[PDB]
Structure formats: C-alpha cells, structure tokens
Amino acid sequence: MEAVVISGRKLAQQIKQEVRQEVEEWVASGNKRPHLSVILVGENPASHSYVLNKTRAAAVVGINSETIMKPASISEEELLNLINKLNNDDNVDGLLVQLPLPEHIDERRICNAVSPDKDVDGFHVINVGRMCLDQYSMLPATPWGVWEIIKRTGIPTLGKNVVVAGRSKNVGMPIAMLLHTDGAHERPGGDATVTISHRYTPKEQLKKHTILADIVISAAGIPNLITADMIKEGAAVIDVGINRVHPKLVGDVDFEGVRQKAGYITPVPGGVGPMTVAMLMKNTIIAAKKVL
Amino acid sequence: MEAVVISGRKLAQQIKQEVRQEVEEWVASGNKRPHLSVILVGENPASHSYVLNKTRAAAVVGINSETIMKPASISEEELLNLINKLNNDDNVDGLLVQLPLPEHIDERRICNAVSPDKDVDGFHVINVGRMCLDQYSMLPATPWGVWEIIKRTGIPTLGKNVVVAGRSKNVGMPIAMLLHTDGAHERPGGDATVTISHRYTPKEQLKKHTILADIVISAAGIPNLITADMIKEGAAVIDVGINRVHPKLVGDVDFEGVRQKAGYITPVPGGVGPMTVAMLMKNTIIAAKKVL
Ligand SMILES: NC(=O)c1ccc[n+]([C@@H]2O[C@H](COP(=O)([O-])OP(=O)(O)OC[C@H]3O[C@@H](n4cnc5c(N)ncnc54)[C@H](O)[C@@H]3O)[C@@H](O)[C@H]2O)c1
Ligand SMILES: NC(=O)c1ccc[n+]([C@@H]2O[C@H](COP(=O)([O-])OP(=O)(O)OC[C@H]3O[C@@H](n4cnc5c(N)ncnc54)[C@H](O)[C@@H]3O)[C@@H](O)[C@H]2O)c1
Ligand SMILES: Nc1nc(N)c(NC(=O)Nc2ccc(C(=O)N[C@@H](CCC(=O)O)C(=O)O)cc2)c(=O)[nH]1
Ligand SMILES: Nc1nc(N)c(NC(=O)Nc2ccc(C(=O)N[C@@H](CCC(=O)O)C(=O)O)cc2)c(=O)[nH]1
C-alpha cells in the first residue's frame, strides 16, 4: 500500500495563517499586540534551535517575543524571582520556561511558579488537573499538535483503537488523555479505545496491541521502535520521536518500511515538530484575549 | 479452572486492624483522636447505606465521626458556607461530601471547596493534578482499594496487560493512572500496559483487548458486561460494578460463568465495597497526622 505522507509544515502554515488574521484584526482595532516571553537556561544546542523556531513563528503571525538567556549556574531563587516579575507584568500574555533545566533545579517547582493564566505550555499542576477532568484548560502544545494532525486530515477517532508508546507527563500521558475522553465534555475528547505502553512493556506485548490499532502514536525516543510487521494495513502512524543518531535526525518509526503498510504517516523532520510550534501560537492568542 | 474467590471483607478486616493499632498508639500518648466529617444531602437510600458503612468502620478503628444531614433543597451558597466552617475547624481532620448531589448543585465547585489537606476522597483538582503527575497525594478510596486487593493477594503488575472498562473521573481514570505509572516515582505506580474502554467502545473491540489481559477491572455499571468467553484462562477479574436489577444487587461480571475460567475473582457484594471503606480510614489517619 502507498501511505499518504502528511506534511506537518503545510498544516502548520494553514494554522499560522489563521492566527495572523486574528492577531491583525485585534491590533487594527487598537488592542495591545500579543506578547510571549521565553526563559532559556544554559547552552543546549537543540534547546536553542527549538526556541528560535518558536520566536520566528511568533514574528510571522504578528506576536511580539522576547528570549531571556540565563547561565546554567543560576539559582532556583533567582529563576523564581524572574518568573514573579513576568507574572506581574500586564504586557506579558504568555510565559514559558524551555526544558530541560540543570540538575540542581527542581523543574516541577518552576512549572508551578508560572501563572496558570499565562501558562501557554499547560505544565502548571492546575492546568494538568483541569485537563484530566475534561475542563477548559491551556493544553500542552505537542499533544494538541498531534490532535490537530488527526482532525484536520479527517481521520476518525470515535470507537477506534489507539496505541500510545510512551507515558511522559508532557507528551504521552496527555495524548492518551485527549484521545480517550468524552466528546460532549467542556473540553471534548476523541472517544477512542486507548492503550498506553512504556519502558516496561515487553516488545511482544507492544506488537500484540499495535496490530489491533487504527492509530499508532509513538512518543518513546527509540529509533526503529515501530516497524512494518507491527502495523495493520491502512492504519495512521504519527511519529512524535526526535532522535539524534550517528550524525543524523530520525523518529521512532522505521519510515521507509512502514510507508509500505500504513494509510497515513508523518515524517521526521517536518511532521509533529512544526505543529508543536503552531499550537503554541494559538495558546498565546488565547492567553492575550483573557477568555480562559 | 477453579478461581480463587478473593474475600474483600477479610482483607478489609486486616487493614482495619492495622489502622486501629495506629490510632490507639496515637491516642494512648495523648494526641487528639482523629475526626471525620461527612455531609449527606437528600434521601437516596443507597447513599445513606454507604455512609452508615463508613461511620461504623470509623467507630471500630477508634475514629470519631459526624454525619451532617441536609435537605435536597439546600442552596449552593449554604453548602459552601458549611464547608468553610469545617475547613477552619482544627478538630476536623477529614471532610467529604457524599455524591451524587441534587441537579441544581455544581459537584465540581463543591469538591474544589474542600481543603486539599482534609480532602480524604482525593476529589479536589489539586489532588487530581498531583495524582496524574505521580506526586504524593490523597488517593480516591475505590481506586486505592482495587490497588490493595491486587497487591495484598500477590498478583504481579509490572509488564502485565490490564484492561479497565470505564473512564469515570472518580473510578475508571484513576485506576488506569495508578496501574500504568512508574514504580520509582514519588507515588509509585504498577508499571502495567493499560487499555481504557468506555460507552463508545464496540463490544467486539472490548473482547479483542480483554482476551490479552492478565487483569480485567470492570467499573462500567452494566450487568453481565464481562462473560467467560472474553477472559483468558488464569486471569484476575476485579468487579467494581454495583447494579440494582429486578430486586437484587449484581456486579458487572457474570460471576457464575467467569469463576470457571479466571484464576482470581472478586464477588459482589463483599469484594471492592468493603475495601473502599477500609482505604478511607487509612486516608483519615494520614490527614490527622499532617504528614501530607
Ligand atoms: N515536537 C516534537 O516532535 C517533540 C516534542 C518533545 C519531545 N519529542 C520527542 O518525543 C520522544 C519522547 O519525548 P518525551 O518528552 O516523552 O521524553 P522521555 O524520554 O521522558 O519519554 C520516554 C518515554 O518513552 C517510554 N519508553 C521508553 N522505552 C520504551 C519502549 N521500548 N517501548 C515503549 N515505550 C518506551 C518511557 O517509559 C517514557 O515514558 C523523544 O524522541 C523526543 O525527542 C518530540
Ligand atoms: N466500592 C465500589 O464498589 C463502588 C464505588 C463507586 C461506584 N461503583 C460502581 O462502579 C460502576 C461505575 O461507577 P462510576 O462512578 O464510574 O459511574 P459511571 O456510571 O459514571 O461510570 C460509567 C462508566 O462506564 C462506561 N461505560 C458505559 N457503558 C460501557 C460499555 N458498554 N463498555 C465499556 N464501558 C462502558 C462509561 O463511558 C463511564 O465511564 C457502577 O456500577 C457503580 O455502582 C462501585
Ligand atoms: N517548556 C517546554 N520545553 C520543551 N522542551 C518543549 N518541547 C519542545 O519545544 N519541542 C520541540 C521539538 C521540535 C521542534 C521543531 O521545531 N522541530 C522541527 C525541526 C527539527 C530540528 O531543528 O532539529 C521538525 O521536527 O520538523 C520544536 C519544539 C515544550 O513544548 N515546552
Ligand atoms: N464523596 C463520595 N461519594 C461517593 N458516592 C463515593 N462512593 C462510595 O461511597 N461507594 C461505595 C459503594 C459501596 C459501598 C459498600 O459498603 N458496599 C458493600 C455493601 C453493598 C450494599 O449495602 O448495597 C459491598 O459491596 O459489599 C461503600 C461505598 C465515595 O467514595 N466518595
């Protein structure tokens, strides 16, 4: 079978065009231009590259952005101080702290310091609790991106079988939460039958579940975790992995094998990555309009 | 095969004996006896019967209890007023509001009014968020009960297949959250591979998942949902359903059929019900000692 290769870049262009229109109508009428603040700690090159993609996307949709660079040596107290100032500044609509942080800093304490109304990553414990109760909330950008790839392509979820490989609190768990929950709730879900797997799932048991799946979502960070023999013909396969191997970028899916069996497949790069960035822009216009 | 019929009543007696010892050592030394307050609204007979089981269990383990009876006609404002007084009373260690409430009352607002330190049901949004991040929290009594049945019987979960029938925010979702999460986190999980199913799961797809399961947990409220042909030989089957049929009580599992195929089975009544009550007593001694 010849899989349709879904272009995340094209879909993200569509979403960015919608955000720009909303922003330019808001500013034309004399309202404040929206503003996003990013705190970046240390010198990790991939972190610097992701934050650049985020601030360029803001530029192109009419959102002002600032990147605050701090050394890896900063204390927890200093970083909390800086977050309190941004929380109290009425020009600042969204605030996020790029992860990961240095070992001496408690990431959970930092995520809980960001005001929940400006928490455009959806990482504050109140935003996590609201999301797990299917209430209105700021949704994490990568999992919302995965959701939009599925919905805008027209792939059905109600009554369908979904397997998620990965249980991380920022990616795998929220994807599983969105896809299994009730379509009639405040924040609608996808009404799918969902399996979550992880590092202690034996490979034989992962395979027995993925062969039943209409949609397989891999967010494990393991090259070639998903291969053609594990997929039922015509399934949708979404690759959320980003793996640097020796010096190259690859996903969790053996693309070249699975493209011969799936009905739909996302590439790495150029799939979920651009969709993460686009959904962040949507969260920022939502924070700026104060409707949540 | 002859299934071992697990006695929830015997297991709950063991847990209540442990709680009584802890309470009587605490009071012998001159500390305040623990105290649990229950608010019961309206005249639902099953609600009145569950609350009686709760206050009798408190009596037998040395915990003082009060049941506050209010008419179904009470306003949201009056009920919030009463919760504020109990929250501010230092004699009161645990506070819970029996559900369901009348249609004119917003249950979510009421659950979020209970102080999170006295929230022995685990229903406040902060307790829900902490639980979904695998942090120390007050766990909901029915899902903790299900967990204790599995652990005290000696049934393994790490790398095993689990199916949960039901996605309710007070029962099915928390059971799924506890069983799939990491054993090394602050609040350890069970490291199982978990499928969640619900009202839009077709019966044919429920069956294709349950035949792979080492543990099947039914929390749907549908008589005879689980039948012998859906179970692999030697599996553990936990019945969390409580269904009044015409005038009789039954679970979600066809007990008489599944007892011939499973390795372990819980009865209704006398299974998960007594374990819900016992784990509530454990949450109350935890709230009274102020260690969380
Ligand atoms: N926009 C994007 O595309 C985007 C954004 C963030 C992260 N990611 C990628 O997602 C992947 C994981 O991201 P994360 O934030 O969850 O990091 P993480 O490393 O915490 O995730 C690892 C998760 O995968 C699970 N896992 C490990 N081995 C497994 C196996 N053999 N089978 C099944 N599951 C297994 C773990 O138990 C854990 O939950 C990485 O490749 C990362 O680069 C992509
Ligand atoms: N201690 C105890 O034993 C205890 C405590 C509370 C509730 N319960 C029982 O648990 C059952 C459900 O409790 P609840 O609080 O979740 O109430 P609920 O009625 O909200 O739960 C129904 C859930 O089951 C799902 N469901 C409905 N039909 C289904 C089907 N055909 N296949 C799979 N799933 C389906 C729904 O989508 C929903 O998530 C009831 O029988 C109730 O009496 C037992
Ligand atoms: N706070 C916070 N920290 C985090 N670490 C994340 N994750 C978080 O930024 N991920 C991410 C991953 C990839 C890209 C990206 O632009 N990917 C492109 C280009 C790949 C590359 O340059 O290597 C692609 O996949 O096509 C953007 C963001 C987040 O959303 N919030
Ligand atoms: N706030 C709040 N509201 C709620 N509705 C619940 N659920 C909530 O009390 N369930 C429950 C169910 C059954 C029994 C019980 O004692 N069952 C016995 C006897 C059955 C009967 O008398 O009908 C058994 O199954 O063996 C106790 C509590 C809760 O935990 N907290």
Author numbering:
A (entry chain A), B (entry chain A): 35 to 280, 287 to 332
From the paper:
The folate metabolism enzyme MTHFD2 (methylenetetrahydrofolate dehydrogenase/cyclohydrolase) is consistently overexpressed in cancer but its roles are not fully characterized, and current candidate inhibitors have limited potency for clinical development. Indeed, the one-carbon metabolism enzyme MTHFD2 stands out as the most consistently overexpressed metabolic enzyme across human tumors.
At a predetermined temperature of 57 °C, isothermal dose–response fingerprint (CETSAITDRF) analysis of TH7299, TH9028 and TH9619 in HL-60 cells accurately reflected their relative potencies in biochemical and viability assays, as well as demonstrating the difference in target stabilization potential for TH9619 in nontumorigenic lymphoblastoid cell line (LCL)-889 cells compared with HL-60 AML cells. To assess the cancer specificity of the replication defects caused by MTHFD2 inhibitors, we treated AML and nontumorigenic LCL cells with TH7299, TH9619, MTX or the ATR inhibitor VE-821.
